[PDB]
Design a protein around this ligand. Structure first.
Ligand SMILES: [Cl-]
Ligand SMILES: [Cl-]
Lengths: 123, 127, 126, 123
């Protein structure tokens, strides 16, 4: 139900501030916490797990083959546990009316903020 | 700039939670901090100063004579220095489009926040 | 779930602006709307129900006897149905990490909001 | 030249980003004539491709670094400020004015305040 493209969108927004290694690291940590096995991610005994897990995760995210689409679907439990809750909600907003409402409320509030700050501005 | 009638409104909202003695006291504190003398408000050397100041301030607030209006106008420096800044903006909103837009935009943001708190409470009780 | 003393805190803040009769009144409508029997509150047929109900509700809130806690625990469905939602969240925050966090972040945003207004009203002195 | 050319460009590009350059050009042109301005040259209400020609001119200067380009944008500032969204004006000026830096900082904190709040509600 969560379309491959929306995982990709949310994942890129998550990677933009500090790069993919941050999302990759947190996804892996939650992946092992959930005792998962598919898709394959290198545990910490590999000295280059992170660079490898990063390259992997974003190759699948950027491909549109059925194998890659499936692998990201399997990873959803780990992404959701690890993603910032506000970003999970955007990811979910295209398939869940609740979360769509959540982001609309978030968006409404910051528009409230911007209009407010602007009214204070002089010049 | 601030019409007498607008001090009255903001002053009544200020007094409703805890009474008039609270605004009067805060007004007096700023009155003296600002080294004022007109109109006259009693320092602590006069008996029942707060009660007498309170009765004074709010008598001027409810009357509409040029004297009542004049004394309230002299008091503005103390009132605004003493009042919650948000309340000053509400007071000024009837005479300044700047502040009207700010209070109006502030109120919408806070209502929109609190409504969301409401939606979360409902999520529980549903569940 | 809600400890008796925390119902009391929330109840007094509700009573602070306009008195005890206001919350009592809102509680009375919700108790009947919610069809309750314990505790006992006087219907509209008593000409001094509201005052007596007001004294009733707030005796239990101010007492700590085993009886009073039991009566106040039953009234919570009415209190929560009638109380300002923000105040229920404050009330629930003493027992719910969810609400502790929600209320906290709410209070910070609004405090930052009001502070901004303070800085603009000050800069008016220009 | 307190406001560096590069910051007018940054601020101008975000303004143009949602709906294109014609919106900023149009709103800027309106303020230019309202202010009875004459330098740099912007075509009055009467020329043919005025908006498109005005759009290209305004954004040619923004993208050049020559002395004439810098000066024409500096001269245009009074119109840009009358027309630009106030929140962006503060952003544009924040590197040269402590007031606007403070505005922009207070704003960004409020938006994080919001995001923390919605996140806390999301669970
Ligand atoms: Cl709307
Ligand atoms: Cl021509």
């Amino acid at each position: 139900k969560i379309k491959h493209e929306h995982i990709r969108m949310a994942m890129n927004v998550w990677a933009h501030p500090d790069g993919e290694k941050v999302p990759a690291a947190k996804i892996t940590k939650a992946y092992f916490e959930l005792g998962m096995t598919f898709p394959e991610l290198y545990d910490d005994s590999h000295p280059e797990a992170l660079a490898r897990n990063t390259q992997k995760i974003f190759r699948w995210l950027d491909k549109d083959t059925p194998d890659a689409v499936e692998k990201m679907q399997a990873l959803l439990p780990a992404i959701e546990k690890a993603m910032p809750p506000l970003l999970v909600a955007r990811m979910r907003s295209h398939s869940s009316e609740y979360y769509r409402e959540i982001v609309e409320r978030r968006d409404r509030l910051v528009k409230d903020v911007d209009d407010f700050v602007a009214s204070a501005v002089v010049l």
